[PDB]
Design an enzyme around this catalytic site. Structure first.
Site, PDB file in Angstrom:
ATOM      1  N   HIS A 224       0.822  -1.222   0.000  1.00 21.76           N
ATOM      2  CA  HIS A 224       0.000   0.000   0.000  1.00 21.76           C
ATOM      3  C   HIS A 224       0.856   1.272   0.000  1.00 21.76           C
ATOM      4  O   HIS A 224       0.451   2.310  -0.500  1.00 21.76           O
ATOM      5  CB  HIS A 224      -0.905   0.026   1.235  1.00 21.76           C
ATOM      6  CG  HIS A 224      -1.752  -1.196   1.390  1.00 21.76           C
ATOM      7  ND1 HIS A 224      -2.769  -1.509   0.515  1.00 21.76           N
ATOM      8  CD2 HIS A 224      -1.750  -2.169   2.330  1.00 21.76           C
ATOM      9  CE1 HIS A 224      -3.355  -2.626   0.905  1.00 21.76           C
ATOM     10  NE2 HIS A 224      -2.752  -3.051   2.002  1.00 21.76           N
TER      11      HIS A 224
ATOM     12  N   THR B  99      -6.129   6.409   8.306  1.00 21.68           N
ATOM     13  CA  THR B  99      -6.680   6.636   6.974  1.00 21.68           C
ATOM     14  C   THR B  99      -6.653   5.397   6.091  1.00 21.68           C
ATOM     15  O   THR B  99      -7.089   5.464   4.943  1.00 21.68           O
ATOM     16  CB  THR B  99      -5.971   7.777   6.236  1.00 21.68           C
ATOM     17  OG1 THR B  99      -4.651   7.343   5.911  1.00 21.68           O
ATOM     18  CG2 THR B  99      -5.961   9.055   7.074  1.00 21.68           C
TER      19      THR B  99
HETATM   20  N1  LIG Z   1      -0.438  -3.479  14.395  1.00 20.48           N
HETATM   21  C1  LIG Z   1      -1.626  -3.418  14.955  1.00 20.48           C
HETATM   22  N2  LIG Z   1      -1.869  -4.049  16.081  1.00 20.48           N
HETATM   23  N3  LIG Z   1      -2.639  -2.692  14.408  1.00 20.48           N
HETATM   24  C2  LIG Z   1      -2.623  -1.923  13.292  1.00 20.48           C
HETATM   25  S1  LIG Z   1      -4.070  -1.182  12.764  1.00 20.48           S
HETATM   26  C3  LIG Z   1      -3.190  -0.498  11.450  1.00 20.48           C
HETATM   27  C4  LIG Z   1      -1.889  -0.854  11.499  1.00 20.48           C
HETATM   28  C5  LIG Z   1      -0.809  -0.361  10.599  1.00 20.48           C
HETATM   29  S2  LIG Z   1      -0.075   1.197  11.154  1.00 20.48           S
HETATM   30  C6  LIG Z   1      -1.579   2.182  11.340  1.00 20.48           C
HETATM   31  C7  LIG Z   1      -2.102   2.649  10.003  1.00 20.48           C
HETATM   32  C8  LIG Z   1      -1.715   4.054   9.732  1.00 20.48           C
HETATM   33  N4  LIG Z   1      -0.551   4.462  10.232  1.00 20.48           N
HETATM   34  N5  LIG Z   1      -2.537   4.870   9.052  1.00 20.48           N
HETATM   35  S3  LIG Z   1      -2.252   6.435   8.679  1.00 20.48           S
HETATM   36  N6  LIG Z   1      -2.284   6.536   7.069  1.00 20.48           N
HETATM   37  O1  LIG Z   1      -0.979   6.759   9.256  1.00 20.48           O
HETATM   38  O2  LIG Z   1      -3.393   7.140   9.198  1.00 20.48           O
HETATM   39  N7  LIG Z   1      -1.545  -1.681  12.551  1.00 20.48           N
HETATM   40 ZN   LIG Z   2      -0.777   7.565   6.248  1.00 23.42          ZN
END
Ligand SMILES: NC(N)=NC1=[SH]CC(CSCC/C(N)=N/S(N)(=O)=O)=N1
Ligand SMILES: [Zn+2]
EC number: 4.2.1.1
Length: 260
Positions: free
Chosen positions: A64, A198
């Site tokens: 992504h 997001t």
């Molecule tokens: N590992 C874990 N336990 N949960 C999760 S939920 C989403 C995720 C990946 S990092 C969270 C997704 C993110 N940073 N979105 S953004 N575009 O920064 O708003 N890990």
């Molecule tokens: Zn992001």
């Protein structure tokens, strides 16, 4: 299993609500920042960005975007102050970008789209680990920085030059000794509001801090972002472009400004 979320016509943002009904929730991100309506909050503090002891470890193409990952097992690289209560540890940064210079950002400013947007993702150390933090309304703080195309950003070039080695989904590379201070603009003036991740799972756990001042990157730098692939090795090429979610309804929220 095989029909996973993405940014295509058949699996993109307009479809996400089917697997993630919170997509239509009360505090979704990103949003349009209406500058004239955002209110200056003189009680907001300066942001404290303390990245001098940051330990970058690795860069990963996750299908992504690409994530530059940090050691978050101690208070090395932390965000404090501003709207935040307590200490938030940097876990990773990544970008969202477009197929053309006139789109790519997630947040917009008076409906203007930037070429890209940098997200420095931090979690609240009172919850102990990232997975616990995303389950809390104040679990994460994401520092968002807009990118416009103009002069090169020298501090970005080390990222750009490693992208050839993580072209496809699931590829990673060692990425030690990268200093994220080189990705910041001069000013730390910001807007802030309560929102969400997001990308799926779209959890409503983020205090957003969006810097007013964009950084400039060169056309050659963003063109290298656009050579990445959403696909895995040995699959048909799908260029990693337009990996942004559009603005979502503001609903019952107020965007606050740190500056007059
Ligand atoms: N590992 C874990 N336990 N949960 C999760 S939920 C989403 C995720 C990946 S990092 C969270 C997704 C993110 N940073 N979105 S953004 N575009 O920064 O708003 N890990
Ligand atoms: Zn992001």
């Amino acid at each position: 299993m095989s029909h996973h979320w993405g940014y295509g016509k058949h699996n993109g943002p307009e479809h996400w609500h089917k697997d993630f009904p919170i997509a239509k929730g009360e505090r979704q991100s990103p949003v349009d920042i209406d500058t004239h309506t955002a209110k200056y909050d003189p009680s907001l503090k300066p942001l404290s960005v303390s990245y001098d002891q940051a330990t970058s470890l690795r860069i990963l193409n996750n299908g992504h975007a690409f994530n530059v990952e940090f050691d978050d097992s101690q208070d090395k690289a932390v965000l404090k102050g501003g709207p935040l209560d307590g200490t938030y540890r940097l876990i990773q940064f990544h970008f969202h970008w477009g197929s053309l210079d006139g789109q790519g950002s997630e947040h917009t400013v008076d409906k203007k789209k930037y070429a890209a947007e940098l997200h420095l993702v931090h979690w609240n150390t009172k919850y102990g680990d990232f997975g616990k933090a995303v389950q809390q309304p104040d679990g994460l703080a994401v520092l968002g920085i807009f990118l416009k195309v103009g002069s090169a950003k020298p501090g970005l070039q080390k990222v750009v030059d490693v992208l050839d080695s993580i072209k496809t989904k699931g590829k990673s590379a060692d990425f030690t000794n990268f200093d994220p201070r080189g990705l910041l603009p001069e000013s730390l003036d910001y807007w802030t509001y309560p929102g969400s991740l997001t990308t799926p799972p779209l959890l409503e756990c983020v205090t957003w801090i969006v810097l007013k001042e964009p950084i400039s990157v060169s056309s050659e730098q963003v063109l290298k972002f656009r050579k990445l692939n959403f696909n895995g090795e040995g699959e048909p090429e799908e260029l990693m472009v337009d990996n942004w979610r559009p603005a979502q309804p503001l609903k019952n929220r107020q965007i606050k400004a740190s500056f007059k």
